[PDB]
Design a protein around this nucleic acid. Structure first.
Lengths: 125, 85
DNA sequence: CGACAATGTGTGATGTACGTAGAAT
DNA sequence: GATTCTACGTACATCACACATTGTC
């Protein structure tokens, strides 16, 4: 029912790469789980149309590249595949892509101190 | 650690494809990179809205407003249903 | 407005589900 | 080159609870 497909902790890590992110609700990873799933589904089908257009039974990277270049909703991907406001936001996204921190960063060191102090059984609180 | 796990992504791709179909490994890698970049895309937009609305906690409605702003409209409504917990 | 109250989320350690890495088909 | 299969070996999920967060007053 709510034992999810992909890991939520990984979605949180990917989110925390943005420095403009302080607190993440529990709703957000669960939403992104199915959001990413539906994204995979749409993109895979859009690429499979091109694979069928080449009479092939295997999905290769060039199929996904063609699917990316055909539709504008995936314009943000053009920089990652071998090939009036929303576009400016896409370039803002590109600039933010360079500034990603995957290092363990503490934001509320008070919570950290309490966690160093809290009583833990088997590592759990 | 910079992308989503590949086994789950590939299984999701398989769920979209017939049993006779096959998936290149390069395609799997490209797909996982694409989904992680989509996550960071939507997260940046949600953070933009939350800064503009003087909020510090990121909620589901923020994510959906971002996704709507980003053109993934047809995603939103079933995700609205998924929200109910 | 900016304070009240109530709702809610960051933070580490660890067992153990689960993804990963190779050969073989 | 791409799938199955088995056994490792990693990183996910889980916990309680002091105060950050929210929107409402």
């Amino acid at each position: 029912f709510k034992n999810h497909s992909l890991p939520l902790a990984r979605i949180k890590k990917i989110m925390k790469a943005d420095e403009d992110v302080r607190m993440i609700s529990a709703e957000a990873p669960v939403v992104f789980a199915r959001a990413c799933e539906m994204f995979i589904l749409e993109l895979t089908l859009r690429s499979w149309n091109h694979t069928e257009e080449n009479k092939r039974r295997t999905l290769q990277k060039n199929d996904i590249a063609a699917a990316v270049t055909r539709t504008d909703i995936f314009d943000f991907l053009v920089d990652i595949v071998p090939r009036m406001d929303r576009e400016a936001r896409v370039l803002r996204y590109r600039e933010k892509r360079k500034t990603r921190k995957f290092e363990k960063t503490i934001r509320y060191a008070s919570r950290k101190a309490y966690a160093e102090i809290r009583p833990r059984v088997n590592g759990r609180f | 650690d910079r992308f989503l796990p590949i086994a789950n992504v590939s299984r999701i791709m398989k769920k979209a494809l017939p049993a006779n179909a096959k998936i290149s490994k390069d395609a799997k890698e490209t797909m996982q990179e694409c989904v992680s970049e989509f996550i960071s895309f939507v997260t940046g937009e949600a953070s933009d809205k939350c800064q503009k609305e003087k909020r510090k906690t990121i909620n589901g409605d923020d994510l959906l407003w971002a996704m709507t702003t980003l053109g993934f409209e047809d995603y939103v409504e079933p995700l609205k249903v998924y929200l109910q917990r």
